[PDB]
Amino acid sequence: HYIWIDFLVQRFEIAKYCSSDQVEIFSSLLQRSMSLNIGGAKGSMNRHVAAIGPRFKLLTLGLSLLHADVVPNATIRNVLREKIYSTAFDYFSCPPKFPTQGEKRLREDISIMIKFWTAMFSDKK
Amino acid sequence: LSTTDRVVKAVPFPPSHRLTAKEVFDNDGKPRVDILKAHLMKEGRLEESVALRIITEGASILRQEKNLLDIDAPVTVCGDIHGQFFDLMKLFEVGGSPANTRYLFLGDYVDRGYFSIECVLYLWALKILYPKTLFLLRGNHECRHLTEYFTFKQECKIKYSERVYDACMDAFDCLPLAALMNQQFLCVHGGLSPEINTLDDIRKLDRFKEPPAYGPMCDILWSDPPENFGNEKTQEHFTHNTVRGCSYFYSYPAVCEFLQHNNLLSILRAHEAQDAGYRMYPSLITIFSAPNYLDVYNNKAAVLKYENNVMNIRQFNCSPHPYWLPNFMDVFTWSLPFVGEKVTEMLVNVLNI
């Protein structure tokens, strides 16, 4: 998933300027993955610490799609933002634990978290 | 220029004393129609109680009249008016004063022209003065559906009241439906009906009601001549009018059969504007007396003088009339949205530095 998401990111970056039909496909793919079920044992995503890279990378991609001024109307954006917020809050519903991955593969996770933090801070609409 | 006094001083300011019954009706109850005509041509209004008294007494007169008036020739026949009061005045100028001219009107006093209430008041005054020599027929717009859809109801509520409107509507409900003219002509606003083969079918109707959604009276008020004349290869007498959504077109064979069976010569009707004020199709003649329809059509008007078994078409041009904004709208409703829009825009620009 870690490399599949990068492939999706680059393809979306090209398709944002190039065409206007793949945008609907990307929106459908993103919308059917997350869910608004912040709770005990149902979030449609693993909650282990060792898998915080792909999660926040996908959330950052969703935020970037939201910030590109592509979706015409104003009711899909509400749903997308609500789902993103729900998943982000859902991640924080377990006791903290320490990372288990190696020395490498840990720096880039912190970098991705910083990028997502900056993107979230910039959002004001 | 004065900031308080009026700029265009040549227009006299209308009196704010609504005229009373004693000022409009003389000792014997006859309307002073020259005074009334001058006042209404000046856009003057009546007191609510006097308008209501005129309308309901006229309704009571129609109520005491037969369904089928037996009006003899000579007569000047007039078609749609559609609120063009100053053209009704021109019509009477061309045809002759009702003091010495017999008249038959085929309806549409209301709907589209903005002097409908003046038309009603003036025609009602003539009906008061000449109850057995001046006759007024019903058109298809003399009903609640259209007068509530168009502006007549709003006009009544601006100038008089809603209850005055309802009383006027009930008077229109009292209007006879048809005329048998010189034992030769059936005179109606719209035309024929599949369910009317004799004058007695008209005489038997119950007219004291809102016009129904279907049936012979509806067709009488609503029907039209067909698009093609003289080349009607079709054999059906009445066919569905897909433009109007109700009632029927009637064909030339239908008219000829009705005339022959009833020993009639033709049928006199209105309802469709004509550039010349008339059209001769003779089994059928349409006459249309509303010049410059909607202030844009630029059409002539005509009347039909029927006398000595001769139909003499007399044309006349339109006359000037006073201006009204659409739907009798006041200046606050018109301008306040723009004020709020531009003040909001300014505030937005002030803040979006």
């Binding site: - | 003289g230 003779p282 001769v310 139909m311 003499n312 078409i313």
Partner: protein
Amino acid sequence: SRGFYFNTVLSLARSLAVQRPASLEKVQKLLCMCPVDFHGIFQLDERRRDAVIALGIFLIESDLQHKDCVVPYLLRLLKGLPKVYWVLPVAESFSFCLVTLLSDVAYRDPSLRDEILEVLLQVLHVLLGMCQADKEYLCKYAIPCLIGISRAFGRYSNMEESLLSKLFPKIEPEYYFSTISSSFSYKEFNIPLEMLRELLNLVKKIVEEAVLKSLDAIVASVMEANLYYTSFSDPLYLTMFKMLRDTLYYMKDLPTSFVKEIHDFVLEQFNTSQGELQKKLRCQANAACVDLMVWAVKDEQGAENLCIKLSEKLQSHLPLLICCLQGLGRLCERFPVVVHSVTPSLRDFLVISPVLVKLYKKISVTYEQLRDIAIDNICRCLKAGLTVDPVIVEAFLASLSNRLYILIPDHTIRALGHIAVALRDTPKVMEPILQILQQKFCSPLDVLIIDQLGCLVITGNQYIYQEVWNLFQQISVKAYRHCSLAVINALANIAANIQDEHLVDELLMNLLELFVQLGLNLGVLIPVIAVLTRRLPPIKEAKPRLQKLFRDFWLYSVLMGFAV
């Protein structure tokens, strides 16, 4: 408004008919939802009729595939038809549809024509068997079935698309389902004389009057005892005479005895009806009898005798008169000798009969169908008579011109225009026509004259185009007011309906020349210019003259300020 079941069934059938070859099991299924026989007595509901119709359309469009299985089912069904239980009448329409698809199938393949025809006469023989043998069932479902099968006896189509296919489109037909006696409108089906003679015997048997009185009486008795028909006599009468005309309309090379017998029968019926009717639906039957009589004329002597009879009739019902004119035209075109006798009567009728004036007809202010029908008859007459006498048309238009020099002039002008347009294939006849039109000026008739000459210009001859351009250019340079809107409408129509490209470009450059001549309410020609130029591809290279005209036109347009 078709629904859902009907539409999807039709879609399935039409998709099946395009897959060639189609597997037999699908057609077996289609017959499976089709009805089946119960002891010789059938039942019918809407869905079963829809299935039968869909199977019929599939067979029609299937390029005649697997007929060996379906055709026996159809003929068994039609054999069982007279006692089919039933749950405009529906029965007559269903019979109309099934007779139609059967007739189309019969035309498509010749190997079965004898079988289909023979079962057809068998079933009408059986129907004739019990019609004159309960009253409710017979009145409700037997005679209406007879009328339904009568509406489409032998009528068939010679088109690239089958006939029933046009009846049910895939997305006028309803008219066929709303009238009383409507119908539809070259291998010459080899029907043996015995079948035709039997059919004539049935026609002669049913046209009897006493049976009509009896059926009317029993219908009245049933009506008073406790339907949509009221009187069967007139619709029947009309139906048998109509299809008697239609079935035998286009047969050739028949024994003379049969022709003589049918001629005697039709003349007897016509004269009896004409004598009785001198005291509505019988007028169409009289027209049918007249058409049959015209078809039943083989000798010249009888031809002019009939022409004299109709000529006496004309100068004494409207469709009867129209059919009389059509029959006179038919006689004139079939026999060239009678031309010298038929032209004077028709010409006098056009230029004078009072019936035309009454049809046009105090009316004081202080028709065309018969007209152009007669004009087309005149054109057919002279185009048929030009084969023998070449000088007849010269004397003819001499007489028309004489009438012109001596309301009526509008009729003469329209007639002359029609002759001029219709006879383009002639020698130099249009030159005298344009000569008399030019010399016949003085005038409200100028509008009709200019419209007529524009119609002539539509033909597209160089010399007449040059002369008409001279006239129109002089008229435009002169500026009457009444002859300006007329000329602009005329040349707009011309530019809308010119075909040859040489004259197109010539008139384009000459219009540009006229516009630049107007260079001292001025730019009224530019709609015509746009209408013309919307018919050509973009201009890349052309004569430098045209480039100069375009440059001058553009500079004048911008200097007057028309560009902004």
